[PDB]
Design a protein around this ligand. Structure first.
Ligand SMILES: CCCCCCCCCCCCCC(=O)SCCNC(=O)CCNC(=O)[C@@H](O)C(C)(C)COP(=O)(O)O
Ligand code: SF4
Ligand code: SF4
Ligand code: SF4
Lengths: 106, 112, 309, 156, 176, 44
């Protein structure tokens, strides 16, 4: 209930400030800027998406690497160490593949 | 004398017609691009008026240079190098109409 | 009384941000042989109030938002997440003690990224979206390295509990054990908050109040990240009977780190997007992976595995 | 009355905020921009007064026209000016911005930025010394201090 | 006669390579620059306290134009109009008529400061030291009309600033 | 007599006109050794 209370209070405070910043300040009359948004009419470059998919996959591998602190308490330390090093080596291998091949163009 | 582009008036008229076609087709887009309040007919009327203003020319060299200048204005209009005011400058609006009647000019001022 | 604690965590942070604006102005000026705000109030102490009052009275212009709904949610999300990230931080005793506080912090920073995307998309502005997407790309790379560094340093903490960091660094600061990770961590924090040299100068459509709140959220995130760096590496002595000592030392450390943030801001030219990503992908990431290997192997090979509980 | 007293005090508070934290946009066009930089230079330090150079015109309060406003640049100046939020004030720096100065009779120079945008403070000089420009800003601050927007609304 | 900037080959000595890698990895030069800015922090700021403190100025300073008078009190301007001619911005407009006494006294001495370039040619041309740019640089106005200075405005400016103007001329006339 | 602003008898003193950027810091080996030593103490 405490954490829920913190979330509620923070959200309500932020929303109240947004109210007093979006609707309260616009009450003051400032004439009227009869100025139309003159619009008269697409850079979908892979340069952006590539940065996104690669991040998704590396974030996935990072997710597998999260339980490591508790995994150090296992009696089978050798096996756990080997598996952790394996996951890290695979992360490095994925990075190397992209770097060696046509990747990391960002 | 070396011709600018056209050796004969007929060749020059060909260039004039080519320019007129481009201006005629560009007017609808121009109204959209600059969000002008003129109608497509109004813009095309102005284009014809501007072409008809220089309709007394007889030298192919002069006609060539007029076409070149006409092209340059079209290039700026197409490339949005001109601004909304620049396009509207063709349509003199704020300028008060100056009368042509002698009696009116007599009243207006010492205008010769 | 718990609500009083929440308020005593929220309000002081906002006031601290307001005065941090003035502190930054003066620090940058005096590093440029200039006097920061000195006319508006004694030593400019009234400058933030003047700025706030002017902002909340300036005519707000509408940015033709494709989705007011979303355009309004983005500021709320940013500010709320910035406020929430302070909750798990142990100033000796945390407001909300989570066994996995560190992961909570990381997740909160991850959600904060959406505020950027929502702002640009709803802005209906090609330049806005382009710049927003650039921000997405920048925060994308920081998160990976930040997570790796945090995991590696917590491999000696023994858990994700933030409070345990104080006990782990009771005798020696963590930085003396993991200084390269500390360097990369600080630079990654700079990248996260887009503080120079990771800015992309030239969500601007936000007018007055909205902008002011986004600015506040960003600076609160600056202070919070510096506090996180302090707790992680610059451990502070805590006497259970007198916690005020730890509170004072921790506050001083956080202030020093924010001052370093400003000091870097006015010391180095801004990077380029290609250069920033060729840092956070081709210099930091391989080193972070290698150091993660090292910080996994070291506790086992030195029989220094920290207690789980 | 009490109502007048409350409105007047609130108006003074609003006036103080704006004049204390004026945010100018550098519309540096010509030689006068250099002296404007010297105003922000350490010797004078406009920021000391709270006047911080706001690159974004959308978050600016004062437009300092510094230089010769040519016909080609004239539409841009007005369009930028109307995209400024209110309250917005225009400070004309330099004889060229004031009335064309050396280029008053030029074929492609606007005879003063006053024609294009309404000006509040005219800073004389060619270029006006940085102190004179700083003096103009302080004069604008005093001009804002005298403004009674709320009082007139109440007494309407 | 010519110096080669850059154009310095890097030594491949293992020690030199080690120090270069140390610079790259440990960010030494960035720390050096950071220390430089920190040093700038502890210096004394160079900001003057305007308007309580004014910046240095020389007696030859050129500012607000002013019409001077002889010690007797007669306007020095004898309507030669050569200052009008020399003015590179054509800002001075002079119209003169024989005064009731009979001297060449201008009936109109108008200078639009909004068109003047503050060059100082006018004061260098005047043969009687009548029009002299004064020391006042802080005369900003709120309306354009005020900048256009009448003859009366110039005379009043001369009467106001005469002490300083005379002192500066006395301190600089030898150089001229 | 002529009293123009003139160079003093003997002229002015020398003026530095070359880059003075000094050399600071330890050798690369030494800096790496210091870092590694701090690491080792931390580990122990
Ligand atoms: C927004 C509206 C913008 C309108 C812009 C239109 C322009 O570009 S004006 C320049 C047009 N000038 C010319 O075409 C020169 C033509 N010169 C001539 O001598 C022609 O009249 C010819 C060659 C005699 C042909 O005359 P006809 O078409 O047979 O009679
Ligand atoms: S007033 Fe003088 S200094 Fe300023 S822009 Fe014009 S010519 Fe240049
Ligand atoms: S040059 Fe001197 S004397 Fe001649 S008209 Fe001008 S002010 Fe008068
Ligand atoms: S100082 Fe120069 S610009 Fe001013 S009146 Fe004299 S000649 Fe004209």
């Amino acid at each position: 209930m405490n954490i829920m209370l913190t979330l509620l209070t923070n959200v309500t405070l932020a929303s109240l400030l947004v109210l007093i910043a979006f609707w309260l300040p616009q009450l003051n009359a400032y004439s009227e800027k009869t100025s139309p948004y003159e619009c008269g009419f697409l850079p979908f470059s892979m340069k952006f998406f590539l940065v996104a998919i690669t991040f998704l996959l590396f974030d996935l591998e990072i997710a597998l690497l999260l339980p490591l602190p508790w995994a150090s308490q296992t009696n089978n330390l050798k096996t756990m160490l080997t598996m952790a090093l394996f996951l890290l080596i695979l992360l490095a291998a994925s990075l190397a593949y992209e770097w060696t091949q046509k990747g990391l163009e960002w | 004398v070396k011709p600018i582009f056209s050796r004969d008036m007929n060749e020059a008229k060909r260039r004039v017609r080519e320019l007129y076609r481009a201006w005629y087709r560009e007017v609808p887009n121009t109204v959209h691009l600059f969000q002008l309040d003129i109608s497509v007919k109004q813009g095309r009327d102005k284009v014809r008026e501007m072409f008809m203003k220089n309709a007394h020319v007889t030298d192919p060299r002069v006609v060539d240079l007029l076409v070149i200048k006409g092209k340059m204005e079209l290039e700026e209009t197409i490339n949005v190098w001109k601004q909304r005011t620049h396009i509207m400058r063709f349509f003199h609006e704020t300028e008060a109409p100056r009368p042509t009647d002698f009696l009116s000019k007599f009243y207006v001022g010492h205008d010769p | 009384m718990f609500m009083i604690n929440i308020l005593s965590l929220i309000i002081p942070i906002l006031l601290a941000v307001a005065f941090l604006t003035l502190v930054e102005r003066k620090v940058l000026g005096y590093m440029q042989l200039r006097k920061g705000p000195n006319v508006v109030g004694p030593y400019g102490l009234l400058q933030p109030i003047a700025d706030a009052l002017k902002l909340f009275t300036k005519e707000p212009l509408r940015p033709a938002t494709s989705s007011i709904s979303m355009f309004i949610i983005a500021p709320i999300l940013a500010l709320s997440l910035a406020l929430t990230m302070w909750v798990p931080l142990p100033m000796p005793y945390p407001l909300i003690n989570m066994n996995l506080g560190v992961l909570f912090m990381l997740a909160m920073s991850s959600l904060a990224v959406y505020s950027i995307l929502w702002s640009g998309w709803a802005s209906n502005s090609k330049y806005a979206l382009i710049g927003a997407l650039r921000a997405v790309a920048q925060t994308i790379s920081y998160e990976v390295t930040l997570a790796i560094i945090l995991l590696s340093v917590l491999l000696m903490n023994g858990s994700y509990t933030l409070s345990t960091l104080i006990t782990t660094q009771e005798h020696i600061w963590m930085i003396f054990t993991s200084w390269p990770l500390a360097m990369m961590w600080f630079i990654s924090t700079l990248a996260e908050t887009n503080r120079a040299p990771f800015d992309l100068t030239e969500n601007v459509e936000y007018a007055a109040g909205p902008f002011a709140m986004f600015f506040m959220a960003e600076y609160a995130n600056i202070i919070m990240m510096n506090a996180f760096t302090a707790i992680l590496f610059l451990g502070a002595s805590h006497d259970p009977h007198t916690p005020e000592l730890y509170t004072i030392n921790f506050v001083l450390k956080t202030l020093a780190l924010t001052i370093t943030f400003l000091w870097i801001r006015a010391s180095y030219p801004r990077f380029r997007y290609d250069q920033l990503m060729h840092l956070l992908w081709k210099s930091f990431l391989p080193l972070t992976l290698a150091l993660c290997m090292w910080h996994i192997s070291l506790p086992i090979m030195t029989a220094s595995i920290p207690p789980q509980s | 009355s009490r109502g007048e007293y409350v409105v007047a005090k609130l108006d003074d508070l609003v006036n103080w905020a704006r004049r204390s934290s004026l945010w100018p946009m550098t519309f540096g066009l010509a030689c006068c921009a250099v002296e404007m930089m010297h105003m922000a230079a350490p010797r004078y330090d406009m920021d000391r007064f709270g006047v911080v150079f706001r690159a974004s015109p959308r978050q600016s309060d004062v437009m300092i026209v510094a230089g010769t406003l040519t016909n080609k640049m004239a539409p841009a100046l007005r369009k930028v000016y109307d995209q400024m939020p209110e309250p917005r004030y225009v400070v004309s720096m330099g004889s060229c911005a004031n009335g064309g100065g050396y280029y008053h009779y030029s074929y492609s120079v606007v005879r003063g930025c006053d024609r294009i945008v309404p000006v509040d403070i005219y800073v004389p000089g060619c270029p006006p010394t940085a102190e004179a420009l700083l003096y103009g800003i302080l004069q604008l601050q005093r001009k804002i201090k005298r403004e009674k927007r709320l009082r007139i609304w109440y007494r309407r | 006669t010519y110096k080669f900037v850059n154009m310095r080959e890097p030594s491949m000595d293992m020690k030199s390579v080690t120090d270069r890698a140390a610079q790259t990895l440990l960010w030494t030069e960035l720390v050096r620059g950071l220390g430089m800015t920190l040093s700038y922090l502890f210096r004394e700021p160079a900001t003057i306290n305007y308007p309580f403190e004014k910046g240095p100025l020389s007696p030859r300073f050129r500012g607000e134009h002013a019409l001077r008078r002889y010690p007797s009190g007669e306007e020095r301007c004898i309507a030669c109009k050569l200052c009008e001619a020399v003015c590179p911005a054509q800002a001075i407009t002079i119209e003169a008529e024989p005064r009731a006494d009979g001297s060449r006294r201008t009936t109109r001495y108008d200078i639009d400061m909004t068109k003047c370039i503050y060059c100082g040619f006018c004061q260098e041309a005047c043969p009687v030291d009548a029009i002299v740019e004064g020391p006042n640089f802080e005369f900003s106005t709120e309306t354009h009309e005020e900048l256009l200075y009448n003859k009366e405005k110039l005379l009043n400016n001369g009467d106001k600033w005469e002490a300083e103007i005379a002192a500066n001329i006395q301190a600089d006339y030898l150089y001229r | 007599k002529v009293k123009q602003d003139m160079p003093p008898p003997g002229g002015y003193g020398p003026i530095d006109y070359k880059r003075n950027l000094p050399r600071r810091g330890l050798s690369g080996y030494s800096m790496f050794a210091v870092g590694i030593g701090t690491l080792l103490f931390g580990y122990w």
